RNA sequence: CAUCUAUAAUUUUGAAUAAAAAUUUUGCCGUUGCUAUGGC
């Protein structure tokens, strides 16, 4: 249950990356480490 | 012990303690002063202090509230009445206590009293909603559950003192036993779409005019219980109303962008439309630039009988009078311009060139919003406020066609939800003290890009002469 | 929450009888056209004058009511 | 020299059409508001055109989806502002995508049509 | 049940105008848009309540 | 609302523990000291 909303939403996020990551003209690994600990922070709630 | 002497002693007193007030200024003016105070209940502004304030050392203060998002005040004002001589405070222990009135998205309701100008207002007391007032049957014909449940959105004390009203997005109307602040009625709106949004007395009455999302104005009466009126005409939602002593109120609603004064005894309401047009104002600028859309209207109130302010969502704040359709004057920004967003940000890439070149210049600059808008009555002095931590008070050209900036005070920081006026001091010198209700967020969505560094609290302004 | 409301419009002095005439709005919700009575009493007390001094005829009731 | 990623953007009267035509929309329920939402739309092939707001943080999020508007043959715009497009498109948290979908059965329908060819030209 | 702001209109035939057009919504006094429900809902509750208490 | 009780300062014995007569900034957290403030 907390699985499938903690991957689920992981799911959404690892789109948000794909889709600047692909996108872009060149990437931001800060910009990734931005959504990284936002989700780390959700799991932390949790 | 006649009623008839019993007027004619009290207006006595009142008489001798003008005469010595003439005996102490002189260390004709009567007539002058009489005059205006009786002449209050008509006619256009008259209160002249705008240039009269000492706006720059105003005193300033900001007081942190326990909770988030206060999203309204109101303060009430016991005034020596001068029709009959008592006062219009209720208790004798009241004997002209000052009381403001604070509600707060965590379904907070607050009464504290501001009696003194140089201390802070002393949280008299509180009450507090919660989801354990949820009508259990959703007939809605009883939503006559006596605690708030969802998002309280403003508040006003009837200017008797006795009761304070408030409502929210949850259809309901909550009037209160002041000092005690207890819920003595719960008057249900009855309609699906009806969420209140903005409440209004008529000044020393007992009629309350009540803004619902459902298009529509509804009117009560307080003391009576009762569902007056039900006015319809406004297009989208509306939004911000307020009123004076006679049977007039001022509604702006908001995405059809009008603004509305209703005459409510014979039934009419006079229609205003903005619409600056962007290709006329650039070519006028020409003749010699960001200029931006009305995209909505936001807060309005009246100065007076004929003219009034009114609050856009791009800047503009213009003064209108009843004749002329179009806002006789008009003013730009004046709130300036939103910061513009941060290139990295904006980007999410490396090439600090790409980032700027996506910034774009100036096809993205913003403005601030109106978020507050008040004046005093009858006076020719208004404050406005924005999220830029500064409320910009202003004096209307006594000419009435136009209005100047007087000053800034930047004691203000986040959103400004509500802006109230006290006066206290003598008539010669009247202590002004201006409170405003400031928190994280706007009072309707949160729609905000996080503003930083704010605090839900009270700013407090006391300025002399 | 309901009561009746009473206005007036175009009033008119008239000396010639000694008296006033205008038009009469009764706004009432969750009623039914509140009684000829109770609106002597009402425009007498709002006038000042006396109940059966005043005087009232002629209503119709707006079509879905009302007013 | 190079165009930015986010043109067109429109001037403000474009945006006024463009935000209340989106409004009276959300309010009659032919309106797909949301990123996903909107490329969902796209997708299922029942949209009558597509907003966007071009100052999102960042912007390539939603820089994305007009490929498939281009291949799909929908028009597209970039208004100046997630937090107007989000008060005006009727929900609690600034919006940055939204997608105005088909039905004939629409009493805005006029509307909708003037303000897409407006559009079109636009482009 | 749907009246035009002010009036009640039960005439299918109106031909509205813009300001019409907008102003369409639900009657003040009709309970799909408003105050207590209809005979039937009154009717059922009433039964509803009485095979209870008996 | 007013009254009455108690709380909070006095009148008196009084150094008063004491006995006596009447009256009337915060939800959390951090910074700052002779109140100001920052973060969630």
């Not at chain 2, 989801?131 to 998002?151: F, L, R, V």
């Not at chain 2, 309350?208 to 999302?213: E, K, N, Q, T, V």
């Given at each position: 249950k907390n699985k499938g909303r903690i991957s689920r939403y992981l799911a959404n996020k690892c789109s948000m990356a794909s889709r600047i990551d692909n996108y872009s003209e060149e990437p931001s690994n800060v910009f990734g480490s931005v959504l990284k600990k936002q989700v780390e922070q959700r799991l932390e709630f949790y | 012990e006649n009623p008839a002497d019993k007027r004619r002693r009290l207006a006595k007193q009142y008489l001798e303690n003008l005469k010595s007030e003439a005996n102490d200024i002189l260390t004709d003016i009567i007539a002058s002063r009489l005059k205006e105070d009786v002449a209050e209940q008509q006619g256009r502004v008259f209160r002249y202090f705008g240039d009269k304030l000492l706006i720059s050392e105003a005193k300033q203060s900001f007081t942190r509230v326990?909770?988030?998002?206060?999203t309204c005040i109101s303060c009430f004002q016991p005034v020596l009445n001068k029709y009959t001589f008592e006062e219009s405070s209720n208790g004798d222990k009241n004997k002209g206590r000052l009381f403001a009135y604070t509600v707060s998205k965590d379904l907070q309701l607050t009464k504290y009293d501001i009696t003194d100008f140089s201390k802070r207002p002393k949280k008299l007391k509180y009450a507090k909603g919660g989801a354990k007032y949820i009508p259990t049957s959703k007939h809605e014909y009883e939503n006559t559950t006596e605690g708030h449940y969802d998002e309280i959105l403003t508040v006003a004390a009837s200017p008797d003192g006795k009761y304070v009203v408030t409502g929210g997005r949850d259809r309901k109307l909550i009037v209160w036993s002041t000092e005690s602040l207890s819920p003595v009625k719960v008057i249900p709106t009855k309609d699906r779409r009806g969420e209140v949004l903005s409440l209004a007395f008529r000044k020393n009455s007992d009629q309350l005019y009540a803004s619902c999302a459902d298009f529509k104005i509804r009117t009560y009466s307080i003391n009576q219980f009762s569902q007056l009126e039900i006015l319809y005409g406004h297009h989208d939602i509306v939004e911000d109303i307020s009123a004076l002593a006679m049977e007039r109120c001022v509604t702006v609603g908001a995405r059809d962008r009008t603004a509305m004064l209703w005459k409510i005894p014979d039934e009419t309401r006079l229609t205003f439309r903005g619409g600056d047009e962007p290709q006329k104002l650039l070519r006028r600028w020409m003749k010699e630039p960001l200029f931006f859309c009305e995209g909505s209207i936001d807060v309005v109130s009246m100065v007076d009988d004929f003219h009034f302010i009114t609050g856009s969502d791009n800047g503009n704040i213009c003064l209108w009078s009843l004749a002329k359709k179009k806002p006789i004057f008009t003013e730009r920004i004046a709130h300036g311009i939103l910061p513009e967003p941060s290139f990295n940000d904006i980007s999410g890439e490396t090439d600090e060139e790409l980032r700027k070149r996506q910034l774009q210049?100036?096809?993205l600059l913003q403005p601030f919003w109106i978020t507050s808008l008040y004046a005093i009555p009858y006076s020719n002095v208004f404050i406005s406020g924005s999220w830029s931590g500064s409320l910009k008070v202003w004096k209307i050209s006594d000419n009435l066609r136009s209005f100047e900036l007087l000053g800034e005070l930047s004691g203000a920081k986040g959103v400004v939800t509500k802006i109230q006026v006290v006066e206290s001091g003598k008539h010669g010198k009247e202590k002004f003290r201006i409170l405003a209700s400031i928190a994280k967020e706007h009072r309707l969505g949160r729609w905000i890009a996080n503003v930083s560094g704010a605090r839900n609290g009270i700013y407090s302004a006391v300025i002399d002469q | 929450s309901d009561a009746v409301t009473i206005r007036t419009r175009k009033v008119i002095s008239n000396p010639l009888l000694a008296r006033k005439q205008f038009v009469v709005d009764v706004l009432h919700p969750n009623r039914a056209n509140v009684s000829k009575d109770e609106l002597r009493e009402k425009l007498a007390e709002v006038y000042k004058a006396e109940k059966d001094a005043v005087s009232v005829f002629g209503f119709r009731t707006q079509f879905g009511g009302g007013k | 020299a190079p165009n930015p990623k986010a043109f067109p953007l429109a001037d403000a009267a474009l945006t006024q059409q463009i935000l209340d035509v989106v409004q009276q929309a959300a309010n009659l329920r032919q309106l797909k508001k949301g990123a996903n939402e909107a490329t969902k739309t796209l997708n299922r092939g029942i949209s009558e055109f597509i907003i966007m707001a071009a100052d999102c943080e960042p912007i390539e999020i939603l820089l994305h989806l007009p490929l498939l508007c281009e291949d799909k043959n929908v028009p597209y715009v970039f208004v100046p502002s997630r937090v107007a497009l989000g008060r005006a498109c009727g929900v609690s948290r600034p919006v940055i995508a939204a997608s105005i979908t088909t039905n004939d059965?629409?009493?805005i329908k006029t509307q909708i049509y003037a303000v897409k060819d407006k559009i079109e030209t636009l482009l | 049940h749907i009246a035009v702001g002010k009036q009640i209109v039960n005439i299918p035939s109106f031909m509205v105008r813009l300001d019409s057009e907008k102003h369409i919504d639900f009657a003040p006094t009709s309970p799909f848009g408003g105050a207590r429900p209809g005979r039937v809902a009154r009717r059922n509750a009433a039964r509803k309540a009485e095979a209870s208490g008996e």
């Amino acid at each position: 249950k907390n699985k499938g909303r903690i991957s689920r939403y992981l799911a959404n996020k690892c789109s948000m990356a794909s889709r600047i990551d692909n996108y872009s003209e060149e990437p931001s690994n800060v910009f990734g480490s931005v959504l990284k600990k936002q989700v780390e922070q959700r799991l932390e709630f949790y | 012990e006649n009623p008839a002497d019993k007027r004619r002693r009290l207006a006595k007193q009142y008489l001798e303690n003008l005469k010595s007030e003439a005996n102490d200024i002189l260390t004709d003016i009567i007539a002058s002063r009489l005059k205006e105070d009786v002449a209050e209940q008509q006619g256009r502004v008259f209160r002249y202090f705008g240039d009269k304030l000492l706006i720059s050392e105003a005193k300033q203060s900001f007081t942190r509230v326990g909770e988030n998002n206060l999203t309204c005040i109101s303060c009430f004002q016991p005034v020596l009445n001068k029709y009959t001589f008592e006062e219009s405070s209720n208790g004798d222990k009241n004997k002209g206590r000052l009381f403001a009135y604070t509600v707060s998205k965590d379904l907070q309701l607050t009464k504290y009293d501001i009696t003194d100008f140089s201390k802070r207002p002393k949280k008299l007391k509180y009450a507090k909603g919660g989801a354990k007032y949820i009508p259990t049957s959703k007939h809605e014909y009883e939503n006559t559950t006596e605690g708030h449940y969802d998002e309280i959105l403003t508040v006003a004390a009837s200017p008797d003192g006795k009761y304070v009203v408030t409502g929210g997005r949850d259809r309901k109307l909550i009037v209160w036993s002041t000092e005690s602040l207890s819920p003595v009625k719960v008057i249900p709106t009855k309609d699906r779409r009806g969420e209140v949004l903005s409440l209004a007395f008529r000044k020393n009455s007992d009629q309350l005019y009540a803004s619902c999302a459902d298009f529509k104005i509804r009117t009560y009466s307080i003391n009576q219980f009762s569902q007056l009126e039900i006015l319809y005409g406004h297009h989208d939602i509306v939004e911000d109303i307020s009123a004076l002593a006679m049977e007039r109120c001022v509604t702006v609603g908001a995405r059809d962008r009008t603004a509305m004064l209703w005459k409510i005894p014979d039934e009419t309401r006079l229609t205003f439309r903005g619409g600056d047009e962007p290709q006329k104002l650039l070519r006028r600028w020409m003749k010699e630039p960001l200029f931006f859309c009305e995209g909505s209207i936001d807060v309005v109130s009246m100065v007076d009988d004929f003219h009034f302010i009114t609050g856009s969502d791009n800047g503009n704040i213009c003064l209108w009078s009843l004749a002329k359709k179009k806002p006789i004057f008009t003013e730009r920004i004046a709130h300036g311009i939103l910061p513009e967003p941060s290139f990295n940000d904006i980007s999410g890439e490396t090439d600090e060139e790409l980032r700027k070149r996506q910034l774009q210049g100036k096809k993205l600059l913003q403005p601030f919003w109106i978020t507050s808008l008040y004046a005093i009555p009858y006076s020719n002095v208004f404050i406005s406020g924005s999220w830029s931590g500064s409320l910009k008070v202003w004096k209307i050209s006594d000419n009435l066609r136009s209005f100047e900036l007087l000053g800034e005070l930047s004691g203000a920081k986040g959103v400004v939800t509500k802006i109230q006026v006290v006066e206290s001091g003598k008539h010669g010198k009247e202590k002004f003290r201006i409170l405003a209700s400031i928190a994280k967020e706007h009072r309707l969505g949160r729609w905000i890009a996080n503003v930083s560094g704010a605090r839900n609290g009270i700013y407090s302004a006391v300025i002399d002469q | 929450s309901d009561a009746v409301t009473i206005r007036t419009r175009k009033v008119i002095s008239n000396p010639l009888l000694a008296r006033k005439q205008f038009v009469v709005d009764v706004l009432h919700p969750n009623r039914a056209n509140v009684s000829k009575d109770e609106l002597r009493e009402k425009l007498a007390e709002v006038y000042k004058a006396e109940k059966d001094a005043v005087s009232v005829f002629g209503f119709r009731t707006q079509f879905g009511g009302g007013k | 020299a190079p165009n930015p990623k986010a043109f067109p953007l429109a001037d403000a009267a474009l945006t006024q059409q463009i935000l209340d035509v989106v409004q009276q929309a959300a309010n009659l329920r032919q309106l797909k508001k949301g990123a996903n939402e909107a490329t969902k739309t796209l997708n299922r092939g029942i949209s009558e055109f597509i907003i966007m707001a071009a100052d999102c943080e960042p912007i390539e999020i939603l820089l994305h989806l007009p490929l498939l508007c281009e291949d799909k043959n929908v028009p597209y715009v970039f208004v100046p502002s997630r937090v107007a497009l989000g008060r005006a498109c009727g929900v609690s948290r600034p919006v940055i995508a939204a997608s105005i979908t088909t039905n004939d059965a629409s009493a805005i329908k006029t509307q909708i049509y003037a303000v897409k060819d407006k559009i079109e030209t636009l482009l | 049940h749907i009246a035009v702001g002010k009036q009640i209109v039960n005439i299918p035939s109106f031909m509205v105008r813009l300001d019409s057009e907008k102003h369409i919504d639900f009657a003040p006094t009709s309970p799909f848009g408003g105050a207590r429900p209809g005979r039937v809902a009154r009717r059922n509750a009433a039964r509803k309540a009485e095979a209870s208490g008996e």
